[PDB]
Structure formats: structure tokens, C-alpha cells
């Protein structure tokens, strides 16, 4: 029982700015991830367990970066690739984000174990970093993709093909945005903050700590402006924030630009090796 | 079989912003290039082969910088200098860019030879840096200017003289933009990336490497936003991206501003001597 207002397409400057950001991210990320992965996984290898975690992070970033040209082409021109490629792109996009977030959480947990229980807990650290990590990160990330696996497809609108998510009704997107927030931002954030609080307390009463702290803060500083955009969009959807429709278009543009800028989490990983390493 | 939409002139802020950028670039570049060229080529001379490559880069940058006042005057006021000066300006502009790009490629190739084949290959390095470089860079750069040599001239529109490129028909500019991309961005980029990958692999299994890596990344970071502007303009020209005409004017303004900002490649060279050197 409400009137509809139709979303208007992005401005021309946005239509030009998204492809260049995507191209820069692709060019940086492909080279950085290829180099780090190759060195870590083929010759010199890794001295420390944290480098092992970083390898999984690099693989996830590479998997994400592979799909960027499709994003740029869709942003500029129409969709031509096909339904299967649409599904694969959406599946990979959903996998990589959760994989990266849970790898970060695992790194924080390993730090916690390395700091407080250093003497007692070497065997648990090795076991967690060797065997448990697969079940911890790769299984739930794969499992969370079933909604995309069903509801992502290409639709024929006149002569234009659209690759998007076609949900049965409105509330599904609200539920999926809520799980996105709860699994990306809140729970791993709680774990990371609690772990670092305990390490700080123990220290009060380290080069490794600094290097893994900068990665996490830089990751969540990039992702933070996106999640307020999603939170507000969800509240607007549930008739809790009825500020009009110009506000809706503005927040849609904000979401688009902010995710485009936050795609830097794949590029951030290899740089820290160049600077800090 | 399409309707035409006429390009509208740049905004007043652009008409003021281009001359100041051009003047700053000219003032920085003339002094920097004069100093580096004078020292390298007249007294102290150069200890290392890379400095020799940099001298060619400096000469190309000086040749480019010489023509900036004409660009500023044309941007502000009408063209008064004449047909021969128009042709000379276009020829020098076309020469300098390709010369700089191929000198960078040569520097990367020399690094590759210096790193992997250091023991075996001193004589090839000396021969390449002494004799082959002229044929490698200066001959093709001169050769690629024949299209500008024929199709660049000044036209009399009422009381206003216009110095531009008047091609026989539309597809010529598409072909020339494609060769611009293929010779500036893609092929030298492939060579540089392949060379640095091999050096990185060998190192895994250097002050000089850092200094010549920063120059190249800073060069392609300045040139990168221009080439997406050209690529999109070419696709729009071939009726592949029919987004309207406001998009066309926006991308034209983007191309203008982005080339104005990317003209910094002449200023970037002497600064690295001050900071890193």
C-alpha cells in the first residue's frame, strides 16, 4: 500500500569513473596477487604461519580480481556473456568476500594464541593452521552461496540482457543483507576486537603485531562506509526510514560508489609486503 | 544513418585550469630537464648505463615541454602562429610520447639483462645501450609521425584559425587511436611486466631496481586514466557504446582534463634525482 518510485541510472561521470577504478584495481591486483602467490607457493616458501594465512587471503583476492572485466563491461555496455557466466561471477563474488573476512578472523585468533598461550599452545596453533582452517573458512563460504546459486540469473528486457538477482519478493533481500552484515562486519569484528584487547592487556602487564594490525584496520576502514549504506537501505526498505525517494536514489549512488572504492581490499594485501616487509 | 550532436566547448573553469596546469608543467620541466641534461651531457657525466638511458628520456621531455606555450595560447585565445608551426607542434608532440615509452621499455630490458645474465652478458648490454638504442627508439618514433605530417593543418573558420587534425573520414581516427594504445600501453607494458616478473622470480630464488621501478609505476599511473578515456571514445565511435550524447561530451571533457593531468610525465623524471638520488 505505497506508491513506487523508479530508480534512475547513474550519472555519466559515474559511468566513466567506475570502469577506470575497476581497471586500476584489476591491473594492480593481478600482478600483486600473482607475485605473492607464486613466491609463497612455488619456491622460497613461507617462514611463518602468518604468511600461510596470507596465502589463502591472496588466493581469495585473485579469485575476486579475475571477475572484474565483466563488472566493467556490464557497467559500460550491455550484458553479452550469458546466464552461466552471470551465475559464476556472482558465486565467485560472494565466495571471495567471506573467505577474506574469515581468514582475517583466523589470523587474529592465531595472534591471540601466539601471544597469551605461547608456551603451552604450539601444537594447537599448528593443528589449527594446518587442518581446521579449511573447514573454518572454505566450507561456510561455499555454503552461503546457495541463495546466489538459485536467485542470480539474466533477464531479457527488450534487446538488453540484465545480469542481476531476481528474488521471489522484497523481504529476501533484507534478510540476505542482514546476514551479509552479521557475517562480514559484526561477528568477526567482535572476535578481532576481543582478541586484540586481551593481547593489549597482557602486553601492558612487537613487529608481528603491528604488521597484522595495520592489515585489519585498513581492511575495515575500506569496508566501513559500505555497511552504513546497506544498513540504511535495509531500514528504508522496511518502512522505518521514509525520507522520500531522492534520498533513495542518493543512497543507491552512495552504495555503488562506496563498493567501487571498497574493492581495494584485494589490492591492499600485496602492498604491505613491499612497504613493511 | 544516425543523427549528429555537436560538441560543446569546455567550461570556463576548464578554460582557466588548463593554462595554469600547462604553465606549472612548463616552468618545472624546463628547469629540471635543462639541469639534468646539462650535468649529464656536459661536465660530471654519467657513472651508470641507466643514467645514459635517462638522458634520452630527459631530451624527449625537453622536446615535449618546448611546445607547451602554444598549447596554452590555443586553449585560451585563437590560433595565430601558422600552418607550419601547427604541423611542427603536432609532430613534436607525437614524437616525444613514443620516445619516452620506448626508452622506458629499453630500461626494463637492460635491467632484465643486468639481473639474470649479469656474468655472461656485459658486452651485449654495452652494445645495446650504445648503438642499437637509436634504431630501437628514434627511428620508429620518427616513422610513426607520417599520419600527423599529412593530416595536421590549420583551417579558416570565419575569422578564427583552428589547428587540428583533419582526417579523410571517421575510421582513420579510430585506427590511429588503436595504434596509439597498442604502441604506448599494451606492448611496452607486456615487456616491462614480463621482465620484472623474471627478475622477481630470480631474486626470490636492490637500490637500482627500486629506483627504476618507481619511475615506471609513476609513469603508467599518470598515463592510465587517459587510455580508458580513449578506449571508450573509440568504442562510442564504432557504434558499440550508444549511451547518448551527454555521455559523449562528458567523456570528451574527461579526456581533455586527463591528458592535461597526465602531461606530468616530463616533470616526473628530474624530481627522482632530487629525492632518491
Amino acid at each position, epitope marked *: 500500500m505505497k*506508491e*513506487p518510485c523508479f530508480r534512475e541510472e547513474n550519472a555519466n561521470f559515474n559511468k566513466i569513473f567506475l570502469p577506470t577504478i575497476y581497471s586500476i584495481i584489476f591491473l594492480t591486483g593481478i600482478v600483486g596477487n600473482g607475485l605473492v602467490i607464486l613466491v609463497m607457493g612455488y619456491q622460497k616458501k613461507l617462514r611463518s604461519m602468518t604468511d600461510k594465512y596470507r596465502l589463502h587471503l591472496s588466493v581469495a583476492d585473485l579469485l575476486f580480481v579475475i571477475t572484474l572485466p565483466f563488472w566493467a563491461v556490464d557497467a559500460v555496455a550491455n550484458w553479452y556473456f550469458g546466464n552461466f557466466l552471470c551465475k559464476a561471477v556472482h558465486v565467485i563474488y560472494t565466495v571471495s568476500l567471506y573467505s577474506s573476512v574469515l581468514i582475517l578472523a583466523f589470523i587474529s585468533l592465531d595472534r591471540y594464541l601466539a601471544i597469551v598461550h605461547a608456551t603451552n599452545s604450539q601444537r594447537p596453533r599448528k593443528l589449527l593452521a594446518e587442518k581446521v582452517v579449511y573447514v573454518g573458512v572454505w566450507i561456510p563460504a561455499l555454503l552461503l552461496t546457495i541463495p546466489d546459486f538459485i536467485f542470480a540469473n539474466v533477464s531479457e528486457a*527488450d534487446d538488453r540482457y540484465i545480469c542481476d538477482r531476481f528474488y521471489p*519478493n522484497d523481504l529476501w533481500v533484507v534478510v540476505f543483507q542482514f546476514q551479509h552484515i552479521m557475517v562480514g562486519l559484526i561477528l568477526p569484528g567482535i572476535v578481532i576486537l576481543s582478541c586484540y584487547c586481551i593481547i593489549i592487556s597482557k602486553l601492558s602487564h612487537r613487529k608481528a603485531l603491528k604488521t597484522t594490525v595495520i592489515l585489519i584496520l585498513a581492511f575495515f576502514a575500506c569496508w566501513l562506509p559500505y555497511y552504513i549504506g546497506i544498513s540504511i537501505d535495509s531500514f528504508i526498505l522496511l518502512e522505518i526510514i521514509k525520507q522520500g525517494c531522492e534520498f533513495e536514489n542518493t543512497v543507491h549512488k552512495w552504495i555503488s560508489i562506496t563498493e567501487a572504492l571498497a574493492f581495494f581490499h584485494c589490492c591492499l594485501n600485496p602492498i604491505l609486503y613491499a612497504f613493511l616487509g | 544513418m544516425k543523427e549528429p550532436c555537436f560538441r560543446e566547448e569546455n567550461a570556463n573553469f576548464n578554460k582557466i585550469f588548463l593554462p595554469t596546469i600547462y604553465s606549472i608543467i612548463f616552468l618545472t620541466g624546463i628547469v629540471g630537464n635543462g639541469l639534468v641534461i646539462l650535468v649529464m651531457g656536459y661536465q660530471k657525466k654519467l657513472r651508470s648505463m641507466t643514467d645514459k638511458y635517462r638522458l634520452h628520456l630527459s631530451v624527449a621531455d625537453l622536446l615535449f615541454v618546448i611546445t607547451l606555450p602554444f598549447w596554452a595560447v590555443d586553449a585560451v585565445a585563437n590560433w595565430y602562429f601558422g600552418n607550419f608551426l601547427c604541423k611542427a607542434v603536432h609532430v613534436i608532440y607525437t614524437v616525444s610520447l613514443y620516445s619516452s615509452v620506448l626508452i622506458l621499455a629499453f630500461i626494463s630490458l637492460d635491467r632484465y639483462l643486468a639481473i639474470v645474465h649479469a656474468t655472461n652478458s656485459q658486452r651485449p648490454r654495452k652494445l645495446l645501450a650504445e648503438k642499437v638504442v637509436y634504431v630501437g627508439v628514434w627511428i620508429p618514433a620518427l616513422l610513426l609521425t607520417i599520419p600527423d605530417f599529412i593530416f595536421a593543418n590549420v583551417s579558416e573558420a570565419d575569422d578564427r584559425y583552428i589547428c587540428d587534425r583533419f582526417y579523410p573520414n571517421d575510421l582513420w581516427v579510430v585506427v590511429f587511436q588503436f595504434q596509439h594504445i597498442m604502441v604506448g600501453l599494451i606492448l611496452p607494458g607486456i615487456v616491462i611486466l614480463s621482465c620484472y616478473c623474471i627478475i622477481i622470480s630470480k631474486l626470490s630464488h636492490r637500490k637500482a631496481l627500486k629506483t627504476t621501478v618507481i619511475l615506471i609505476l609513476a609513469f603508467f599511473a599518470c598515463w592510465l586514466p587517459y587510455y580508458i578515456g580513449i578506449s571508450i571514445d573509440s568504442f562510442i565511435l564504432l557504434e558499440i557504446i550508444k549511451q547518448g550524447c551527454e555521455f559523449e561530451n562528458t567523456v570528451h571533457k574527461w579526456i581533455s582534463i586527463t591528458e592535461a593531468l597526465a602531461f606530468f610525465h616530463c616533470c616526473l623524471n628530474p624530481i627522482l634525482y632530487a629525492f632518491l638520488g
Partner: antibody, heavy 125, light 112 residues
Framework: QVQLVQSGAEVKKPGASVKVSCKAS????????ISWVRQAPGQGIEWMGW????????NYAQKVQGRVTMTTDRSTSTAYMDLRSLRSDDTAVYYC???????????????????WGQGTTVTVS | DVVMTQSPLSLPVTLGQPASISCRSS???????????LNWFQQRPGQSPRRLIY???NRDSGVPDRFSGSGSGTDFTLKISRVEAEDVGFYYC?????????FGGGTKVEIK
């Protein structure tokens, strides 16, 4: 194939209420809005409404607003339209035509009017 | 809303000869995106209207090449190269750019 099937023709007294079903099949019903178009006999085609099957964001034409409520039945993939306080000149033919496109990131309205229903005629006596 | 007038109202045509129908708008049919969404319908007597051409010139799949349209701005035209005996019926032009959509007056094609 994609097709829309309507109900039969009806005759009703003035002041009554009429509901016309519009069953759609051959495509995902929850990704295209539906617009209701009425053609008066011997007159130009006219528009009176549009409902988004995605989340029920109805919209009405000014000339008929206040007398029509139109809803969808997503379970059986059908769209209805209810008209009350019928007048003498309401005798006409009603067409159910697919309109728009609704998605997670795309909710435009300029892609449609492709497939039409068989149409039904209602008269007042 | 946008109002479109279609001419001529009645167009007697002779078999084997081309014919043209043109409708003019009151507001420019140019979208912010950069396209023009104006499409033509044909309604045979006793059945629902069908789509002939969508947008100014693109042809809807399933119709012969005889039907073709052109125009820009606020003037549009549809032309039939050859008139057969099955081309009798009403023709409408409508726009989908400005909410709400508006149809045309209607043109009836007879046989002369």
C-alpha cells in the same frame, strides 16, 4: 512460450464491483510488473494502472483513482483488479499487459508492453 | 502527460503500394540514458494488439521486413513497403519514457 490468459466477459449493474483475473505463465512471474490497460469501444486506448509483483507497489491513473484496488496472488501467479462504483460509460475491454522490470539492483519501467492478454469485455446495464 | 497526435486518421491504400503513418509528440522523447522509447502496435479486428517495432527503428522478431520506422526528436514515422490483404487494421504509436505511458489516436488502414 510466454502467455497471459484472462477470464470471461461480464455484465453487472451500476454501483456493483468487478474483479478480472490475469493468469500468467511461461516466465518468472515475480520479475515483471503488470499494467492494466482499458480500451473504450470506438475510442483510443487508455491506461489506468500498474502493480509491481515484486513487492506490491501499486499505482493508479488520476481519472480512475479512488475506485480501483488491484492486487496480486503470487502463490498461484495471478494478478487481479477490482473496480467499484461502475458508471454507464465503463462498458469497455480490459487488457492485462506485462510492463517494467523489477530486480535487486534494477527496478526500471521502460521495458515492457510486449505480451498482452486475450482481453475481457465488461458492460453495465 | 505527453500527448501524441497521429496522422492520418483514415488512410486508404492500394494493394502493392507503400504507405506511411506519422505521429508527432508534444515533448521530446529523449531519455536521460540516451535512447528514445517509442513503439508501434497493430490491432486486427477482434484480437489483442501486437507489437510490430520497438524503439524508433528496431524490428520486433516475428514480423516481415515490409514494416519499418524512423524519426527523431518529436517526429516519428512508420512505413509499409508493400500492402497485402492482411495489413488491414488499426495502428497505434505509444511512448514509454515519462510516467505514465500515453498511447496514440489510432490509424485505420483500408484497401483501395
Amino acid at each position: 512460450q510466454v502467455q497471459l490468459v484472462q477470464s470471461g466477459a461480464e455484465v453487472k449493474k451500476p454501483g456493483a464491483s468487478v474483479k478480472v483475473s490475469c493468469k500468467a505463465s511461461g516466465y518468472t512471474f515475480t520479475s515483471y510488473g503488470i499494467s492494466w490497460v482499458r480500451q473504450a469501444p470506438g475510442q483510443g486506448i487508455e491506461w489506468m494502472g500498474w502493480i509491481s509483483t515484486y513487492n506490491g507497489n501499486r499505482n493508479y491513473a488520476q481519472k480512475v483513482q479512488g475506485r480501483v484496488t488491484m492486487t496480486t496472488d503470487r502463490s498461484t501467479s495471478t494478478a487481479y483488479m477490482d473496480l467499484r462504483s461502475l458508471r454507464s460509460d465503463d462498458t469497455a475491454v480490459y487488457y492485462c499487459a506485462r510492463h517494467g522490470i523489477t530486480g535487486a539492483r534494477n527496478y526500471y519501467y521502460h521495458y515492457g508492453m510486449d505480451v498482452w492478454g486475450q482481453g475481457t469485455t465488461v458492460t453495465v446495464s | 502527460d505527453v500527448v501524441m497526435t497521429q496522422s492520418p486518421l483514415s488512410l486508404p491504400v492500394t494493394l502493392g503500394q507503400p504507405a506511411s503513418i506519422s505521429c508527432r509528440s508534444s515533448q521530446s522523447l529523449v531519455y536521460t540514458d540516451g535512447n528514445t522509447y517509442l513503439n508501434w502496435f497493430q490491432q486486427r479486428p477482434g484480437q489483442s494488439p501486437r507489437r510490430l517495432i520497438y524503439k524508433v527503428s528496431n524490428r520486433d522478431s516475428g514480423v516481415p521486413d515490409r514494416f519499418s520506422g524512423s524519426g527523431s526528436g518529436t517526429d516519428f514515422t512508420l512505413k509499409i513497403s508493400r500492402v497485402e490483404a492482411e495489413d488491414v487494421g488499426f495502428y497505434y504509436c505509444m511512448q514509454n519514457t515519462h510516467w505514465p505511458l500515453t498511447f496514440g489516436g489510432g490509424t485505420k488502414v483500408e484497401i483501395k
